[PDB]
């Protein structure tokens, strides 16, 4: 059936850029129009690009128009979203998504791959051990703050839970 | 030139059984220049992707069932659930693909009215409480993976300040 996977997203400073590739599986690819769409961390959903089904047709919002290109590949069965310029309002997770040409836009959407705008570097050249015990005290911070998380889905767990140990 | 989808209610909260009916406005005339409406409907488990559910207002995408309902008439168009199940919770979403740029609303969350009191889902099956407790596991791997790619953003200058070194 129908798989996509999406790649190529990390980390990149603003005004750098960055490519995407969602490699399809289970389908003509070349009869399908393909489109990428993002969602930004607050769970906001953005339509990115659109490409045809040959690729002689684009579309872009306003948004993205300059700075993003979306292109595609029918004989490795690759669709490519390339991202120049980025800034601080594109750190979102983005999922490329399959079309019917003429009745919907959006049918069946990847995992998809998350891109976070890195926003500091001036002030860190100096001791070289003094950034090894740095970079290693910023360790239990992410823990705790991972620990808060996985307590906070304990509490939210501990309801069914006790609903299902009641029949 | 853009058109605004306004979402409505932002939260839903009903109990198993009963009907569910969520609004969506356009701001502007939404008809297609081939003369159809493309207003689709979408809904994203949590931690999971959008799946297409309804498509131009009022047709059902295969593999919806019966339950679910669309209808329109202009700029105010409506998502209906005749009998809200476990499997219908969720964020959904309308859409417009009629007028570049092409536009998403702002999301209406349909949940469970006080389940997270237990008293409140003793009337639920042992199959969909597990159900539930399993949809809560990509939440918790996408807010904890969130984390993590802060404290990547967080590494990455003392390794490029290494890296020189
Ligand atoms: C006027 O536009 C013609 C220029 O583009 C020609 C591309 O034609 C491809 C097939 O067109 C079928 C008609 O499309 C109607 C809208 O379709 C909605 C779902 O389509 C998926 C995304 O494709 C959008 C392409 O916009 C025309």
């Known amino acids: 059936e129908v798989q996509l996977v999406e790649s190529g997203g990390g980390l990149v400073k603003p005004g750098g850029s960055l490519k995407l590739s969602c490699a399809a599986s289970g389908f003509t690819f070349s009869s399908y129009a393909m489109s990428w769409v993002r969602q930004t961390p607050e769970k906001r959903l953005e339509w990115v690009a659109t490409?045809?089904?040959?690729?002689?047709?684009?579309y872009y919002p306003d948004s993205v128009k300059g700075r993003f290109t979306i292109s595609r590949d029918n004989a490795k069965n690759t669709l490519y979203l390339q991202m120049s310029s980025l800034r601080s309002e594109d750190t979102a997770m983005y999922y490329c998504?399959?079309?019917?040409?003429?009745?919907?836009?959006?049918?069946?959407w990847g995992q998809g791959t998350t891109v976070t705008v890195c926003s500091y570097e001036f002030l860190k050249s100096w001791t070289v051990e003094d950034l090894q015990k740095r970079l290693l005290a910023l360790d239990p911070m992410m823990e705790q703050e991972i620990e808060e998380i996985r307590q906070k889905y304990q509490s939210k767990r501990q309801p069914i839970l006790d609903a299902i140990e009641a029949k | 030139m853009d058109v605004l989808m306004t979402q409505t209610p932002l939260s839903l909260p009903v109990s198993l059984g009963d009907q569910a009916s969520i609004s969506c406005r356009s701001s502007?005339?939404?008809?297609?220049?081939?003369?159809?409406?493309?207003l689709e409907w979408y809904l994203q488990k949590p931690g999971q992707s959008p799946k297409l559910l309804i498509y131009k207002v009022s047709n059902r995408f295969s593999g919806v069932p019966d339950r679910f309902s669309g209808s329109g008439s202009g700029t105010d168009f409506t998502l209906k659930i005749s009998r809200v199940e476990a499997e219908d919770l969720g964020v959904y979403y309308c859409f417009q693909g009629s007028h570049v740029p092409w536009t998403f609303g702002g999301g209406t969350k349909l949940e469970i009215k006080r389940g997270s009191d237990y008293e409140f889902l003793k009337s639920w099956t042992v199959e969909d409480l597990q159900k539930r407790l399993l949809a809560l596991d990509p939440m918790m791997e996408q807010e904890i993976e969130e984390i993590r790619q802060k404290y990547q953003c967080k590494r990455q200058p003392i390794l490029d300040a290494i890296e020189a070194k």
């Open positions: 502007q005339s939404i008809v297609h220049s081939n003369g159809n409406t493309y």
């Open positions: 998504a399959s079309a019917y040409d003429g009745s919907y836009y959006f049918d069946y």
């Open positions: 490409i045809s089904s040959g690729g002689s047709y684009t």
